[PDB]
């Protein structure tokens, strides 16, 4: 797995459950391109993404629906989404956790990447 | 006035100096168009981007041009940009405020909306 | 002027007002004295604390009494307090801002260290 | 393992390895007590720090050592060290994950606490 998703709540300390994600990759013509999506866990982790194979070099878009999650909550934050830009890969495969904490009006990303 | 831009190094504890800072509209066929742009000064800040009557209610992207930032530095960065995507609403506070505090592979930022 | 706080809420996008701060030097049998104190403004800052002359090399402690804000707007907080040890030196920059960002289960805090 | 203390390195997208962690309860007197110690792993985790039995109600802090951490790394950085205030087990008992996120001038703590 080269790359996981973790989605944190920093307003009750807790993991953001059911957060939607939806991740890009950046076509020959400059456009972003459909590549992986799913949803945060009870753990707020999104595993299963990609594939060694699949994920090759290039600049990838980490998307997270940060709005609707706090709107489920009662709460109206500031962003639309947390984005996550990033080259991946680009000296040999890595793997990527994208870590984001969220709060109404302020997120944090922090990405840890290992050498297999 | 309605819209300042504020960049802090964490690596360094000071202003994040010279770094390209850019603002785009979401057009009526979702595509992103330019709106404004600049560079943070001395203090980090970047002032004058627009006026009460160009920042009309519509959704906004702030592009942060950290990646440059960072390898001016000889730091090895791990983002593209930091992105800041949010709906202006004319229901709030009149100024807004977007921090970002950098590090090469972490960022956080945090809107402050206020009345002057 | 060599040491200023300021303190953000990141749930409401706001400075964090009448927020107590309280300032201390470690002595010289290791216990922390008294040494300055106040509350954040309007704009959630707090200037005064101390003097050139006062504020000499040695270790501080501030303590941002953020339980106490959070309790007021009736969310529950993990925290205590927000707490910032460091040791000035008369080699560096002569400004100590000392910055706060709060959440009820998360902060953070950085320096940004200027010469005016 | 009610009680385990995660680091990061902000700086290189890394856990943070051997940190040392103190952790200290307050005494019926006001005074910290030593309540038990240990380094993170190679993962920056640091476990086993106490037990469900142990781990009583009351007002802990837990000292990262950061300082001695960047100075390694050839960085001379702010803080003294990380510090982490909070009451503990007071509705019954919790699990607490207590995460520090480490720059040289800037760091985050957030608590992650769930009910067994
Ligand atoms: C000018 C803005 C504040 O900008 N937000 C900051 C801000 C936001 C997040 C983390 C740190 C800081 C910070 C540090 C020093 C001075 C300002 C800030 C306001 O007062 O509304
Ligand atoms: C990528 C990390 C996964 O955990 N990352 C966390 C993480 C990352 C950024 C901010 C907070 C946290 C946090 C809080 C509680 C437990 C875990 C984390 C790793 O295992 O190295």
Same mark, same amino acid.
Do not use: Q
């Given at each position: 797995?080269?790359?996981?998703?973790?989605?944190?709540?920093?307003?009750?300390?807790?993991?953001?459950?059911?957060?939607?994600?939806?991740?890009?990759?950046?076509?020959?013509?400059?456009?972003? @391109?459909?590549?992986?999506?799913?949803?945060?866990?009870?753990?707020?982790?999104?595993?299963?993404?990609?594939?060694?194979?699949?994920?090759?070099?290039?600049?990838?878009?980490?998307?997270?629906?940060?709005?609707?999650?706090?709107?489920?909550?009662?709460?109206?934050?500031?962003? @639309?989404?947390?984005?996550?830009?990033?080259?991946?890969?680009?000296?040999?495969?890595?793997?990527?956790?994208?870590?984001?904490?969220?709060?109404?009006?302020?997120?944090?990303?922090?990405?840890?990447?290992?050498?297999?």
């Amino acid at each position: 797995c080269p790359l996981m998703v973790k989605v944190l709540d920093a307003v009750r300390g807790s993991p953001a459950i059911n957060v939607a994600v939806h991740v890009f990759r950046k076509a020959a013509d400059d456009t972003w @391109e459909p590549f992986a999506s799913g949803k945060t866990s009870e753990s707020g982790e999104l595993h299963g993404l990609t594939t060694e194979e699949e994920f090759v070099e290039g600049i990838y878009k980490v998307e997270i629906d940060t709005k609707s999650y706090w709107k489920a909550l009662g709460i109206s934050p500031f962003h @639309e989404h947390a984005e996550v830009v990033f080259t991946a890969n680009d000296s040999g495969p890595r793997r990527y956790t994208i870590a984001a904490l969220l709060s109404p009006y302020s997120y944090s990303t922090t990405a840890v990447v290992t050498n297999p």
